[PDB]
């Protein structure tokens with residue numbers, strides 16, 4: 001599987017190997033803020049990252065993943081639209097070549113410079129691989145990034161990217177606190193969707209925060225120095241690793257806030 005983000009292997013090609021690309025609950029989507037409806041039934045959202053145990057950061061040729069020890073209930077997401085407990089397994093970002101693009105979700109068609117995905121799996125299914133086979137297997141917390149003031153909690157990530165420039169490189173990344181990547185408000189939109197990369201499985205409850213975080217131009221410029229290619233291969237900058245908005249079809253986006 002040689003999927004990627006280029007002209008010949010990018011999102012418009014994915015459906016040939018992954019026909020669910022044209023399915024009924026694909027992600028990302030445009031969030032039309034005027035059509036999203038407040039749902040007074042949503043329970044409070046609970047992000048409990050105090051005992052999070054990061055392990056490693058990996059360039060997988062598509063993005064970089066900060067991985068967590070998910071062998072115990074440490075860092076979990078509960079409440080909101082969710083039933084039960086979802087354990088953090090990894091986070092990663094999608095970003096652009098320019099500050100005007102990079103996010104996967106859009107808000108009233110606005111693209112942000114980047115989008116953070118904190119990926120969690122439903123502990124009722126025992127492991128991530130079983131969870132992705134279920135319609136309620138994953139919860140992905142999505143957070144927009146805009147360019148402005150630096151995000152101090154991001155800088156440790158930024159500073160290790162030089163050591164994982166190319167596809168397949170990993171580095172120790174212990175003691176990283178993902179609480180430093182969250183905005184002040186947990187107001188959110190939620191809808192049922194999919195993974196935004198192959199295999200595009202329709203197993204995700206999306207929770208997209210309304211408040212973006214700000215990162216500096218210098219921080220995102222360092223994301224853009226990463227490579228899609230492996231070591232010793234021709235350089236292809238890791239930029240524009242985002243899937244565009246997909247048809248909403250038979251879905252409603254719910255808001256947690258008035």
Ligand SMILES: O=C(O)/C=C/c1cccc(OCc2cccc(CC(=O)O)c2)c1
Pocket residue numbers: 117119132195196197198199
């Ligand atoms: O290597 C293989 O053959 C199968 C890989 C595989 C098999 C099953 C699942 C799966 O999920 C990958 C994943 C995890 C989290 C998020 C996303 C989409 C995104 O970039 O936001 C994709 C990957």
Ligand code: NA
Pocket residue numbers: 108109110111
């Ligand atoms: Na717009």
Ligand SMILES: [Zn+2]
Pocket residue numbers: 092093094117196
């Ligand atoms: Zn993602």
